[PDB]
Design a protein around this ligand. Structure first.
Ligand SMILES: CC(=O)Nc1ccc(O)cc1
Length: 115
């Protein structure tokens, strides 16, 4: 509360660490469905169904231009990519399996890096 503070966690390296994690996700062999935005003009259903599209290139642009106020807002956009993928794709599809794999990959990096 007013004039009563928790000890300050060192967040000075957060931007650099999130960038390293994103680089590792960009270079994963299963990253190909998530590198660029889904083409809303060529994929039926996607625009109406998926209310907040997100992809790695869009996350990279936001990270590079100061659009994440903190760690957690970054993780929210990464998870959104995989939540969108589950909504639109069957678990037993190539893109469906890719999404499950990349989510597992991310969450281990997230825990190891910040927890
Ligand atoms: C991330 C994603 O769902 N991509 C995607 C899914 C189906 C399709 O026909 C074209 C692209």
């Amino acid at each position: 509360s007013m004039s009563v503070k928790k000890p300050k966690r060192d967040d000075s390296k957060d931007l650099a660490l999130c960038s390293m994690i994103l680089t590792e996700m960009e270079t994963h062999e299963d990253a190909w469905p998530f590198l660029l935005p889904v083409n809303l003009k060529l994929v039926p259903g996607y625009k109406k169904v998926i209310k907040k599209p997100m992809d790695f290139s869009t996350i990279r642009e936001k990270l590079s231009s100061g659009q994440y106020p903190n760690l957690e807002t970054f993780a929210l956009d990464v998870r959104l990519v995989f939540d969108n993928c589950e909504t639109f794709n069957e678990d037993d599809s190539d893109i469906g399996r890719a999404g499950h794999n990349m989510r597992k990959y991310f969450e281990k990096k997230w825990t190891d890096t910040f927890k």
